[PDB]
Every structure is written in structure tokens, then in C-alpha cells.
Amino acid sequence: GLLDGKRILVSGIITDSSIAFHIARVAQEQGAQLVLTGFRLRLIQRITDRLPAKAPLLELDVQNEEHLASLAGRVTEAIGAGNKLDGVVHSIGFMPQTGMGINPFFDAPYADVSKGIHISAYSYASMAKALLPIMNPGGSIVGMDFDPSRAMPAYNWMTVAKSALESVNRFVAREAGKYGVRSNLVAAGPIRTLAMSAIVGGALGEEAGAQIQLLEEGWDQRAPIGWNMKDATPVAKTVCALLSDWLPATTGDIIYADGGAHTQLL
Amino acid sequence: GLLDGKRILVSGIITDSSIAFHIARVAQEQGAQLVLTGFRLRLIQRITDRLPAKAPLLELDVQNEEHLASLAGRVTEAIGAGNKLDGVVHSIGFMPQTGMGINPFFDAPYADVSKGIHISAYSYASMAKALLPIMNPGGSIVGMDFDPSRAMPAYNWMTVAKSALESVNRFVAREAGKYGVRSNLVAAGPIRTLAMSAIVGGALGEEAGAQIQLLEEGWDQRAPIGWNMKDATPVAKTVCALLSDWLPATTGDIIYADGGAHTQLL
Amino acid sequence: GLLDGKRILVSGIITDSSIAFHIARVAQEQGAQLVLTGFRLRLIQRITDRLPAKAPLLELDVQNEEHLASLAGRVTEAIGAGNKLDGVVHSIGFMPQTGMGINPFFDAPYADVSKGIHISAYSYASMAKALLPIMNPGGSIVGMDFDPSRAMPAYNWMTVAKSALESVNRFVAREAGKYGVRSNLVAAGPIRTLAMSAIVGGALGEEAGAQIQLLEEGWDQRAPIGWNMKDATPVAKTVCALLSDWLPATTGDIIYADGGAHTQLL
Amino acid sequence: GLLDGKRILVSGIITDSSIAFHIARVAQEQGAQLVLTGFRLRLIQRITDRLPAKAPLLELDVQNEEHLASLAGRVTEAIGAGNKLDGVVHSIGFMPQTGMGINPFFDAPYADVSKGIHISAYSYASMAKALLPIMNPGGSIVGMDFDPSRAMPAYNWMTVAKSALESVNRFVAREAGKYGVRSNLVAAGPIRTLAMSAIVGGALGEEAGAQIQLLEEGWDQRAPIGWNMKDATPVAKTVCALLSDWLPATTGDIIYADGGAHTQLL
Ligand SMILES: NC(=O)c1ccc[n+]([C@@H]2O[C@H](COP(=O)([O-])OP(=O)(O)OC[C@H]3O[C@@H](n4cnc5c(N)ncnc54)[C@H](O)[C@@H]3O)[C@@H](O)[C@H]2O)c1
Ligand SMILES: NC(=O)c1ccc[n+]([C@@H]2O[C@H](COP(=O)([O-])OP(=O)(O)OC[C@H]3O[C@@H](n4cnc5c(N)ncnc54)[C@H](O)[C@@H]3O)[C@@H](O)[C@H]2O)c1
Ligand SMILES: NC(=O)c1ccc[n+]([C@@H]2O[C@H](COP(=O)([O-])OP(=O)(O)OC[C@H]3O[C@@H](n4cnc5c(N)ncnc54)[C@H](O)[C@@H]3O)[C@@H](O)[C@H]2O)c1
Ligand SMILES: NC(=O)c1ccc[n+]([C@@H]2O[C@H](COP(=O)([O-])OP(=O)(O)OC[C@H]3O[C@@H](n4cnc5c(N)ncnc54)[C@H](O)[C@@H]3O)[C@@H](O)[C@H]2O)c1
Known about the structure:
The structure is a homotetramer. The longest helix of chain A has 22 residues, at 110-131. Chain A has eight helices and seven strands, in the order βαβαβαβαβαβαααβ. A seven-stranded parallel beta sheet of chain A has the order 3-2-1-4-5-6-7, with helices on both faces. By secondary structure, the first copy, chain A, is α/β, with parallel strands linked by helices. In chain A, helix 2 links the parallel strand 2 (33-38) and strand 3. The first copy, chain A, has helices at residues 19-29, 41-48, 65-79, 110-131, 156-177, 194-200, 206-222, 233-243, and strands at residues 7-10, 33-38, 57-59, 85-90, 135-145, 182-188, 253-257. Chain A has one domain: Rossmann fold (3-Layer(aba) Sandwich), CATH 3.40.50.720. Chains in contact: A-B, A-C, A-D, B-C, B-D, C-D. The interface between A and C is large, with 40 and 41 residues. The structure holds nicotinamide-adenine-dinucleotide (NAD) (4 copies). Residues 12-14, 18-20, 39, 60-63, 91-94, 119, 144, 146, 188, 190-191, 193, 196 of chain D line the site of one nicotinamide-adenine-dinucleotide. Chains A, B, C, D: Substrate binds at residue 155.
């Protein structure tokens, strides 16, 4: 058991195709006791019933100030007073279709970009602010990322939200360090979630479906060890490695679980 | 004359200590014909009267949708129909004191961070969207930046705004390339503007004044050729080099005018 | 047992203060079966006698073409016919004092620089060439590194050799990927080995000694979680995480075990 | 005249297709007074005869310690006693075909790799060591580079030598800064020199020829402003901008003259 006895909060489960669902499943397989958060709760309760073990499901809208202000208290009620968190998983991402997809880069209104940056980047800090007081020293906060160091088609303002998230992670590390807590991001390669498969199937047109297929083919080609977009397990394992006590001198950083694709040009 | 005959729009002049004032002064010394934009216009008209040559001053609030929608037309009226821009200088930056300065990183409300990101990063794209239709092929768009790849004290959410601006610049390059136009950022070292000198004088307390002095001393120490925070000229010259035809195969990039400080650990 | 059942070759043990000694000790505490290499085998035998468990000790001078030609055969005789290695640890670094220390950067003769790059950078590829034919799919090659992205005092040509090692690692990942094997480096913060503590005491003079002390002190300050030069365990555990099956999608990459110092400016 | 009155040493001219030839031609078109070096001086004399203006041609084999010892004295005899250089251009790269091309990465003997790093990386420092005592404050040393941050087919050990050159540049900046001199590299996209066009035609085989063609074709596609392998002028102008007084605060750095390709994923 890699995470034996650890109490880990896991956000971002929407379906059993979510990266967070696999992070939760692998953490439970490694002995961690989970607390799950979710923004449609009826679907969430049905989805999480497919996890190896039972886990309390708390409601969390990262834009709702009341949900965040009460979060530490609601978590303590779920795990019991006298207990604290050893880990936190931020697997939350959102960008309206005006800022991500087929809409031209310049045509995204700032109100939609601002909402995307609030959920995808600012929420990493507001979740750390809420949960650090109830975290044990030696704990770990892990956020999900997708390498934004180079521009690419369709991802557009979500790439901008990820460049902001990377900057936020380095400042969250400064704050988290005071609690003896690490803060890191996992830059994952593309994973065929329900929305990603729908895009490949033509939900966003044949040009967006071709650009995503080209990105996926190129990812597997550049990755020295290959990249299977239908397998979320290598990413979930990497998040568990950062949640464990086996990367204890790593903080404010990014671990690439992308098959090594970002290290190769061709 | 490095910029002989070129028509360059220059935003961001507030006082004669502004980086944009020195960019405008050096561009005029190199033969460029300027169009200046400004967000308190009475002070601006008095300040720009100290420039080597006359230049029309247009009003531009980057958050005002009407100011941006009319900008290309207002610029054409200032330089004359039949004429286009060869360059655009974005020297605009803002972050309320809740997100930059002495306020703790986690205590910045999202509304203030969102406003800071709108002016400091999103506006680089909205200015490029407005001005690219009236730009000549071979033109150049230059934005001002401050290396955000590593976290630091006090700069806090403005560092996050700069990481977002760097990502925006790479997408603006994709769009600008269609017009044969380059888009680059200049990452400058610290420059003693009126606000920066006030901070060193204790406007933000003795701890912020010590952290800024430590940053400035360390910048000059790490810079192999030294760094004079009271001299804006090396930065203004670098912006002019990118505006010229002497860096024609460089776009989506960052040029460091920081004395080389970012290339040295100590 | 994090590395239960795994056969791991560990090079670089010279004294009980070497990072390789701590890597070997933690790898054995986690159930791995080791093969040790040495370049003085009688004195290395006494050092490796202090490890929790016994392990076959093979002679390997990375500059000796014959030692590398026979290496795979000598490893198979030590681990059993039909068996393969699951992990390889390169913890070998060398730079004559003409290229590292108080000697001016320009005063390093190329013959010394060449020997330093041969042992520190080329040997990573020649060890992978000799051991990849005898490694299992899912295997892991880990090399030791220090961040050379920014120049610094005294390290001089050792930094250049580390920049070369980073590039070699990315090409070793291309080759290793054909075998299902990962190749990664661990960029550690400064560790007080027998030589580093002597250099601080005055072995290289008061000016270089002050520069090294200032350089090493800045690590603890920049690191959000702190940094203890006297504790090699956080570095050793990070190596064992890369050798395990918990980072299965990371190759051609660098993991920073530096307390997060490289992510902070000050 | 961008370089009017400046004395600039230019190494690396072999044929009229060399980047050094175009750098020398553009430098002379901009008013600079040149000093050329060569390693075959009678055949280089005929090539340099095609430049706009005459220039003294000195012999320089970067591996010859005697050529480097006498270099400063031979440059002063050519430019006049009391005079100093304002610029130095290192455009020298070499890697035996065992370390670059179709030979497997692991099959490169170290003797060949060592010679390649000596000419491509070490020679940048040994040229700066010999010429810094005879350079003016405000001077500029420019080396030629290709982006080696990501591995790629065929370039193999030449990429490793470029990673080493990037590190050497940052240390040469520390030393050069003591003289008021800058040191920078220009990372160019692929340029069709006599060798590159022969490799595409089939000199290295159909598999490597296809890989090189695919690699070089991806540059034009990724570059927001496009990329013409047959045009060396954009690279030559970028070098002249670094040699001028228009980038006076940039040192230890890399300027990318690659059409912005390195800033885009696809
Ligand atoms: N799927 C990929 O290809 C991929 C690759 C790299 C990184 N990522 C990142 O991994 C993370 C997980 O995304 P995913 O791919 O599993 O997709 P997903 O569809 O499962 O969505 C992630 C979650 O974000 C939640 N969320 C959205 N708005 C929220 C709000 N206001 N409050 C709370 N939660 C909110 C959703 O409910 C969902 O559960 C995201 O940060 C994503 O950007 C995804
Ligand atoms: N001064 C430094 O140390 C330094 C260093 C590196 C980068 N920079 C960057 O350089 C740029 C110039 O800043 P500066 O240091 O010259 O400061 P400055 O005080 O002159 O301010 C820059 C300008 O931004 C303008 N601005 C703010 N909100 C605006 C809005 N809504 N619409 C239009 N304009 C608006 C201000 O009116 C001002 O003219 C900024 O992007 C800044 O972040 C500054
Ligand atoms: N000590 C630190 O501060 C530190 C920090 C970060 C990274 N590193 C890296 O960790 C690695 C291990 O170094 P260390 O700090 O344990 O020092 P160390 O004194 O233990 O020396 C490293 C090893 O290299 C071996 N070596 C040298 N030449 C060799 C040859 N020809 N053949 C075989 N082996 C040879 C030595 O015998 C020694 O065991 C190095 O690559 C070093 O650069 C060290
Ligand atoms: N051609 C490209 O695609 C390209 C792209 C980016 C960067 N570069 C770099 O530009 C530089 C110039 O290369 P090029 O493309 O003009 O090729 P080139 O064929 O002109 O060769 C470079 C020069 O190096 C010289 N050289 C080799 N060994 C030497 C020695 N012992 N002493 C002195 N000079 C020596 C050669 O004589 C030649 O003039 C190189 O450093 C190269 O890596 C080239």
C-alpha cells in the first residue's frame, strides 16, 4: 500500500472516464482513505459507487465563496475531528467553447476567459487556502496540468489558463511549505475522456477532429515509450507517486506523465 | 535611423518615468512617426510634450469595448487614410494591491486578479485583434514582460498575469503571422519608475522596501554586464530592435533585456 | 517494499557519504536485489559491507571499452542466466580541478574538460548501450544531475558536463523506449559529501569557499520546503520512485529533488 | 549603417552557402570592418573574394593551441595597434559522421564525440579567452546554435554539443561581462547549406533522408511567420542585431531566428 493510512481529498470526478476517477481508484487500491468533492451530484453518487471502497462525497463549486469558506469544516466532519488530510487532488478544468475549441483565439470574450481562469487556475490557490489549515506536515497537493509552454490549435485560452495555473502552483508551494506541505502539478498527455472521444467522433467538426487526431498520433510518435490516450492509469499512478512519501524534496514543480513526448521534437 | 519612416503605436505612457515614454523617445530619435495611446489624459498631454517630436494622443481604456472597436478607425484618422502601422507597443500593466504588493498571496479576491489579468494579459490579444487589420506586412507587435518562470515575493498575482501574457503572446503570434506580422515580448529587469522608487522609499512598508532592494541588488550582482535600475534606455533600445527589420525571423518569443540576470544563479 | 523483486544495478559508491550509497541502502530497504559497480574494489568492498544486505560487486571503469563490452555478460553471471535488470543507476561524475573549483573558466585545458564529459555525460549513454540488451520491459535508467540551466561560480565545466548529460538523457530515452525502458535524471540540490564539506572548510581558498557557502545557503532559503545538505535520503527516495512502477509515463526527463529551490527566484 | 565603424571578427566561412558568409556580407553592407578567419586558406580566399569588401584573412584552427595563443597579436597587426574588436562571430560546428547522421546514437566512439564538442562547444570559450583582452567595452560575442532542448533524429551528438555550447555561452558571459562585453547565441532554424541539401538528396540513405525532410518541413508549418531553409539572410540580420548597440542588455542568452517554430507545438 503506497498510500496506506493517508487521507486524500479528490476533486474533479464527473464520470468514470475522468482522470480523477482513476486517481481515486488507484489511491484506494493503495490503501488511501478518500474524501471526494463534486460540483450534477446525482450522477457523481452513481459514478463513485463503482470505486473499490466507500468515500464521503462533499459538494464543492470552486466559484462559490460559501462552499470554500465551509470546506475545511465539512471535510473534518467527513473524516472525523482529530484527523487531517495528507493529500489534496485538484483535477478541475473548465473553459467555455468561446475560449477553447473551434472559436478563433481573438473572439473569446473576457468574461468567458475570466471564468475559465477562475475554475482552472485561481481555484488551485483557493482550494489550497481552504485545506492547508487541515493538512498534516509531509502532505501533498497535486493539480492536473497539460504543457502550455508552446501554443497549439484549439486549446487556445485553456493553454493560457494552464500557463497561469503553473505560475499559481509555484506561489502555492511558498505558502504550503509553511505547513511542511508540497504542491506539484502533473502535466499529462491527452486522455480520451468522454468529451475528448466526442471531439474525435466529430462533435466539434471535421477540422477539430483532424487536429485532435493529429495531436494524438504525434504524441504517441514523439513519446519514446509510446502514449496510450485510452489508458488513464499511468497518469493516476504519477499523481499517487507525488501524494506518497517517495518524492519528498519536490515542490513548486511539474511532473510530466506524457510518455516523454515533451522531451522530443520528432 | 533604425525606425525611419515606420508608423508605431505606443501605449502605456503615464509619466516621463514610464518604460513606454523611453520607448517613444528612442523610437522618435530613430525616425519613427508615433501614435500614442493613453488611459488621466491631462497629465499625458503635458508629459508627451517633453518628447522630441509631436505625436497624436488617442484615448484607450483596454477594458472599454467601444474604445477597442473604434481604435483602428481612430488610428487611421490620426496617421491618415492610405497609411498603416508598422509597429505596436503594448506597455500596459495593472494589478490591484490585493494581488500585488504586501497582501498575502491567498487573500487576493478573484475580481481583483481577473481585472489585473484583463489589463495585463488579455489586452495584449484584444489590442492585436484591433490593430492587425491596419498593420503592414513585416510589422511588429511588442509587449512588456517581467520573467515569471520562478515565483518571487510581492509580485504575486502580477507574476501569474505575466505567465498568462507569455502564453497569450504565442497565440497572438499565430494570428499575427497571417498578416506577416511578428509578436514578441521584452522581459525587462526592474526599472525605477515613480511607483518603484516610492516602494524603495517605504510606500509599502519596510519589509516590502527591503525585499525590493534585495531583488535590485541581486539583479545587478547576477547580471554579467550589470543592471542599472535607474536607466530605462537599454530596455527602450531592445523594444526598438524588435520593432526594426533586424530580428525578422523571431516571433511568439521573449527577449530578455535584464543584463543577463536570468541566465545566472549567483 | 517499493522495489520488491526488482534487480537494480547501482554505480557510483565510493564512500558511505556518496549519494549512490544512500540510493543502494534505500533500494535494499525496499526489497530490491542489487548489483554494485566500482572503479579500488577492495576499499569499495568494505564500504558496501555497511549496506543492509550483500550484493555482487563488479569492476567498471566507464572509460574502459573492455569493461563495458563484458559488462552485460558479467551482470548475467551475477544475477542468473535468463534474468534481466529492472533498473540501472548512474551516479558517476568527474571533472578535474582545472575545470571545476577556483581555476578560471577559460584556463581549463580541453584534455581535462574532455575527460570530465566522458565520465559525467558520455558514460550515461555507454552504460545504457551495454545494459539495455539485458533490461526488462518497464525498466528504469536513472542518472544523477544538478540543474545547469543557469551558470554559477566554481562549478564551471562540471555545469557544462551536466548540460551535456541532460541532452544525452533525452537521446538515451529514444533508444531505451525501444526496450520498454525509461531514462530519467534526478537533479539534486547540494549534498555535503566528503569533498563539499572540505571545500567549505577552506580547501579551495576563502573566496571560492565563501562563494560555495553563499550558493549552498541560498538553496535552503529559496526552497519552500527547506533544504538539508547533510541529508541524502530525500534524493535517494526520489531515485527509488523513478526506479519503481509509480512514474511509468515519464522518460527523457528531469525530476528535481532540490526542496523546490529551482522554482523560486528569492 | 547598423554596424558603422565596428571591427568584427568572423569565423566559419567555408563556402558562399555558409551562414558566416551571409553574416559577413550583411555586416559589410552595414558598414562594419571585418577580420576573417579560416582553417585551406587559398580556397577560402576565393570564397571571401565574393564579399562586398576586402578583409584580412587569418588562419585559425580552433584545436591548435599555438593559433589561439597568437590570435590576439595577429588580429592587432591586422586592425592596427591601439585598436580593439567590437564583435566576434563564432560560426564553427563539427561532428564526425559516427556521431551525427545515420549511425546509431550509442555507436559513436567517444574520440569522435570529444573532437565534435571541442570544435563546436569548447572553441567558443577558447575564442573568447583569446579575443576578450582585445575587445572594446560594449562589444559583442555571437555564436551559432540550434535548439537542443528536445531530442530529434540524426542530429544525435551534434545536439549534445549544442547543449554544451549553450552552457559554455552562459559562463563566457560571466567572463565577458568583466570587459563590458556581451556573449549570446543565435538558435537558427534549418538552413540548406551544401551538406544539408545533399543529405536530403539521399547521401545518408532514404530513411534518414525522409526523417530529415520531415523534421525540416515541420519548421515551416510550426513557424507562425513561415521558414525558408534556402534563405540565410534572416539569420544573418539577427546576428548583426546582436553585434549592434540595439540589444545592450542581453547576455548569456539565446535569440531564436527560427520563424518562431520553437514556440509552437503544431
Ligand atoms: N483529459 C485530458 O486530456 C487532460 C490532459 C491533461 C490535463 N488535463 C487536466 O486534468 C484535469 C481533469 O480533467 P479531465 O480531463 O479529467 O476532465 P473532466 O471532464 O473529468 O473534468 C474535470 C472536472 O472539473 C470539474 N469542474 C468544472 N468546473 C468546476 C467547478 N466550478 N467547480 C468544481 N469542479 C469543477 C468537472 O465537474 C469535472 O469533474 C483538468 O484540470 C484538465 O485540464 C486533462
Ligand atoms: N517597471 C518595471 O520594473 C518593469 C519591469 C518589467 C516589465 N514591466 C512591464 O512594463 C510595462 C510598463 O509598465 P511601467 O513599469 O512602465 O509602469 P507604468 O506605471 O508606466 O504603467 C504602465 C501603463 O499601464 C497603463 N494602464 C493601466 N491600466 C490600463 C488600462 N486599463 N488601459 C490602458 N492602459 C492602462 C497605465 O496608464 C500606464 O501608463 C508593464 O506591462 C509592466 O508590467 C515593468
Ligand atoms: N554531491 C552533490 O552535491 C550532488 C548534487 C547533485 C548531483 N550530484 C551528482 O550525483 C552523482 C554522484 O556524486 P556524489 O555526490 O555521490 O559524489 P562521489 O564522490 O560519490 O563521486 C561520484 C562517483 O563517480 C565515480 N566515478 C568517477 N570516475 C569514474 C570512472 N572512471 N568510472 C566509474 N565511476 C567513476 C566515483 O568513483 C564516485 O563513486 C554525480 O553524478 C554528481 O554530479 C551530486
Ligand atoms: N546549417 C544549418 O542548418 C544551421 C542551423 C542552425 C545553426 N547552425 C550553426 O551555424 C554554424 C555554422 O555552420 P554552417 O551551417 O554555416 O556550416 P558550414 O559547413 O559553413 O561549417 C561551419 C564552419 O565550421 C568550420 N570549422 C570546423 N572545424 C573547424 C576548426 N577545427 N577550426 C575552425 N573552424 C572550423 C568549418 O571550416 C566551416 O566553415 C554551426 O555552428 C552550425 O551548428 C547551422
